[model samples]
Target: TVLATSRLHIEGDFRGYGSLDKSPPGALETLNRLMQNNHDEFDMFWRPDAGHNHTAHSLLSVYALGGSSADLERAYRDDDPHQVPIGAVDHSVVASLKDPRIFIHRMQRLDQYSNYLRFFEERIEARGWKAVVVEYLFSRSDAAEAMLGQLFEGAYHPLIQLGFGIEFELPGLVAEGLAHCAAHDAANIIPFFQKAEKLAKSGSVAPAPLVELYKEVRDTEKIRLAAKMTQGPVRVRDGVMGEAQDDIAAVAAKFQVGPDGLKQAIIETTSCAAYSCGGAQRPGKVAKVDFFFMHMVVSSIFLSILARQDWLETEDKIRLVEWKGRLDLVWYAASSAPALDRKWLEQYQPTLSAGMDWRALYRAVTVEPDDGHLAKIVRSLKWAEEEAKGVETSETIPVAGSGWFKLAQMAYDSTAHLPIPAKWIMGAGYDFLWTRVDSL
Candidate 1:
């Protein structure tokens, strides 16, 4: 269980609670109390972003339709809002009789600025907490600011989150709560990227400010159950992969049966088939995502390391890169296997085409068999997926900052456009491996 470490953060204050309570009071204080219990980081729920409460929208729709909440209720569901609420009025809700009861406190019509003034002043208490956040909708930044002043006597800071263009909800993170973990985001959007961009330039700070309470655990097996499982960022302290390669050269000169540091780290730490027990260990990024996806990244990392290390001849490194590319063709094909189930035979799969025809050299150096190199590489790639079974969300790959839902969506769109077959795309990779490993 001496595996890599993982940590968790929160989105939406108090983890998506209190918003449902009809302009609930004490939400910020409540957030502080719960956040104190167990959390590494968090962000306030964007009051302006898409949320379930449509009470305000319903109220607005009535005005537009020359109708009222009566027609509003008939047109849209009592609880569902087509878009995220946009003004101070958005927080209020009207639930059906059958639905869970909501104990609204001092709730008002939300149609006017003065009503919002009362809600902010009366419902939200500052308690002198500069870090606390309570989100509510406002059309303009200035108006939001003015109301923020009125709410807490001009003290609370505003953390803005928004999206432009008509398709905001296409990839908005409002669906993912409010925290900004690994916030940079690979997508042009989603929220981590949305608000993270603001924080990167602005002087805005974390809720806790100057407190380094984030925790990381070493053993994956011994920690909290699968429910608490997540991966942390990969560490970067120079190109240690190359350093390890250099050490391997030194070890080779001194004479040892095993490989050098970098290769040894990859072999020992990586256990697609099984975890190795020998050599020193360094922690890397955790992949809650399945194996094939994890290894694509992992193998890519090793390839980078291999390229970085001066010990490997340039020709050999370049060959390996080609080999890695060939491997990707095969891996991406298999990744589609469970989805396609056409069951393309491994023997017919395409493989890499590297120079010097040193297919044997790779197997020889790694001490793998004729076909062993292909098997080893494939097995190496499978490491994380195997370990990740029985885990929820064993789908889409997610790196630190961005979300992968759209990543796969992009893949799907491209796939739909291309008229390629799994077996066909995989053919080159298949032959290359078998031909290289088993060929004379």
Candidate 2:
């Protein structure tokens, strides 16, 4: 069965323990309690000899329960603190979730399979996962085509299971088409094609054509990747990959496209879904949580990309500009503030500077404000603070009449609606100043 086969059994070894003196006093007690409670659910044994092979078996039990590594991680990091320790399960659980073997196992047990599939379908209906897929499909133009194709072939597992009528109400041709495209092997395509052919022959419009088209597109993408791999290292330009004339060209290409495109695709897809799915048509308190989650995720990806990469070319610079604009839009739209008034700079610039390009400071601040005018002013103050502390350097600082304290007050008033504490903002200012001075 899919679940059984996909179940991960992890074993590791530990060695060279200096002493047990520093170990937590309750370590053994905790272990004893865990063993006692989970005795029926697991098998446990200990080896005394130092050289004895001690295989620590950690099974991916959650596969039977239905969860992914991402879900588990989210639960661990963000779920209610009072919940059970299930979220703390090892990463092995995630690996097991993705293993195809688990899906196969789940498919074998007719009773369990029916129950699991029904549960999945109901949950998707309750949570409206279909709308999420459609939103992602329409949102990102560059990746829209790919995502549309993914939606047809079943890009996400939850949707795929539903498309095949294994776990929920059978989806229409569009959903099935996506599942076919997403299938890792040609075997899965045959069944979908057969189903499509039957539907067509039964006096219904055939979905086989769309499925074939998706397959063609999928093949084209595969060929593109294969060709790139065989052709050797290529550079990225204007968000597309191409050959470079020099090493610098290659470097620039790496900076521009690299993994940022992939990251952005994920962020935009998720954010678009959150925005469009099951919310007040207009921004309101009802949608605030989802909006906050979506934008925060988008901001996180942007900041992460900036942190990881060092040098960038003109094309990459342009991409960063676009990301900044999106960040601003998300900030403004979700909060019902004028675009110019949103102080994204105070929220993100310091982290961006430390991890990403210090040059971003200039580019971001120079951009026009639409709603939150104070955002620009706060950013200017931040830039000046960074400059003074040597977090960044500039030919000129924009300290005309307004001094640090006055700038701080402006920032405070601008970001008044933000969830952060006043002391945290003050601390940020202090840190920025300290870093600037220390750098000099």
Candidate 3:
């Protein structure tokens, strides 16, 4: 889960708005004056007026709520405080605006400063700042989860929805652990774990017979079976799963029932649904169809576990499962049925509009559709695009800094060709064929 936080500072002079000889005005007058000035300053940033008066309500509120005049003085003198810098003209304006007449007029008619403070305090207390902060913090996490889920659903649903009965689960365990570490002091972790359990229970389907068998059998027996099943000469090579022997051994152990069984079971069951030896000649083309399926399965299991726990409500569990399903769809399409041709490319089109084919164009450029890799890339692209849309300035960086410029250049350089490449067509066909075989 991603966490985003921001702090807002009140701008301009808040305290010296009136003469020291007169009593201070009540909170409402102070607040109104500050707000009016702040709004003026904000307006000036867009449309500058030399005679414009900019009051800082936020600043006055801070002051009225116990922030010292010394703090404001220091902030003005040093040019930097707990928050952002304030301009000299702005500071001067605030000093001049603190008229004794205005303070005395408002102060005499309104409640006393203590009474005003009490009123303000009650209002603020009703909507606690701490609660607001917490809500904002969690809302961001929820937003990220929602966005990711939506992306997955939109990108991969067509592929996964095709009756292969597959699912995926990326251990929300890791995400939850990280969240706990990140928000240990501020957030409640128990609720998260409870949510996880509920999500698992609600979303996960029962294990298949093969999966059950793999979990039930002994490790030695599974390893023996693996040894018998592997016919070709073993070659040592290091890659994603490390050495082939290590991969095979890990796969073998997963199928076992005991402590070493987890890996063997996962591999065997996944391989059964996802892998295929193309014509007994091409071993490297072993496609993994069940990748999405596995994702859904795991997601469901994790969510179901969360649902069963008391930490999360039924609504939360449902939302978690829905998100999991959506994400799994993305994983499935990118992993299981990636293509470089028009047909495969169609999956990337935006679902909201009609008759637009962005996916086809995307495939024409970046031919490979490895889901795990593509998911991150697509997400980054989406994030950048969304961020760019919100920027007020024309010169604002698209993806920020120079790195995105390099990526854009690279993408352009690689996909300059208009029509599909012949090699791509062949590669896509071969890939699809292998995937089809794996599905069977």
Candidate 4:
């Protein structure tokens, strides 16, 4: 019942709003139509089945990368098969379900996605997305803080949803993100976040380089064994959070960032994600990026985007980035705490010498038949590499000048040959996860 329109005006100048004015011909129009199509036609999830409905995620990523209208259309067409129809949302039910507590960990209900979207959309329509975001995400009350934690949950999809909305300055997408946050489960992991907060207030730990923390997680026996390859889909929630909760909370609490540390934090986070994706390989095996870790990089792209927003309070920005940093580590541990090999990353040889350049890689991913995440990661690496240029030291940001290109090449090389479904190695931590999907 909401009007379909393009309100994607980047109201304030945000750092990660990539190529906003530089978008190609007809791209904005195409993005406008496609985004509306996603809001109206698709469910938040692709189906009653597991995967998220990536229609919005991909379209927003395509638009962000300065992709053409054709690129947007192609991505939309590719994602169409998986999208389920959005059902009728009841006004009475949405009105009654206003408390954030009612929405947590309730994936058992099938109709909640559309209802929550409507629930938040109605609020956004009345109060504006920024006000609602501040109230729900930055309010600091127990209910608001607890709900905000859910944003980092749900496999980072909810965070990505809000990232696109805030990055693009779209109202409805923000509503969808808040709604997605409300609907997804995060009960098991919220307590560890609370523990990290308690530890943060008690005293500050000397912050370690993000890469070093990855090594620490891998070396720590308790944390590494927390997740098993056998846990399957719920490995992070069921295994890592369930078992190694305190161990990770202790290490993750050390990665605290203040407003001054934000830039370096962005560089470290993005590089760490790329390094993990590119370097977590067995000696002789062909290089492959982890499916779970790839999301961390793609999701990391939004950290700067969200942090740079002028309207958001500095304290909130720090908390947001810090929580995300913790979530990235949690994901790394859940991936069985794979050791990062920098030399292996440096030694990687890309397919085409021409593929080594950022512009060429951008073009390659933009035109490919991808679902949109690939383009986002490529764009994120390009951002991270450019951002690293301002920092004078390599002590914190581990990836060197050429390391970015190598990581980008590794990402492109990893997924370029395989069919759409098997593009990434599911759990890069364990050899067993690759068993049936190994042939491609």
**Best-fitting candidate, measured by TM-score?**
4
Question: Cα miss at 302, model 2 (Å)?
Answer: 5.8
Candidate 1 per-residue C-alpha lDDT over 264-355 given as tens digits, one digit per residue, 9 for 90 to 100:
22332222111110001112211112233333433333333333443345544343333233222222222221111111111111222212
Rank by lDDT, descending? 4, 3, 2, 1
Candidate closer to the true structure by lDDT (higher is better), 1 or 2? 2
RMSD of each: 24.6, 22.0, 25.3, 3.0
What is the clash tally of candidate 1? 20
- Angstrom error of the Cα, residue 307, model 3: value is 1.6
Once all C-alphas are superposed, what RMSD does model 3 give against the true structure?
25.3
Q: Write the per-residue lDDT of candidate 2 for residues 1-440, one digit (tens) a residue.
A: 12221121221221101111121233333322322232212211111111100011010111111223332232223212212221122334323423335433333111232232222333344444444233323344433323332222211221222222221222221232222223222112222222332443455342221112212222333211221212211101111112211211111122122333534332322222222211211221111122222222222222222323333333433343323322222222222221111122222222222332223322232221212222222332333333234312111222212232233343333333443222111111112212322121
The estimated TM-scores of all candidates read: 0.17, 0.21, 0.21, 0.91
Tell me the deviation in Å of residue 106 in model 2. Answer: 22
Error of 1 at 180 (Å): 16
After superposition, the stretches of candidate 4 with alpha carbons farther than 4 Å from their true spots are 1-16, 20-23, 47-50, 99-110, 204-206, 352-356, 434-440
lDDT agreement of model 1 with the native = 0.22
Per-residue CA lDDT of model 4 for 56-152, tens digit only, reads 8777777666678999898898787658788688778787767645544343254677887887787888888898888877888655786678888
For all candidates in order, the CA lDDT equals 0.22, 0.25, 0.25, 0.75
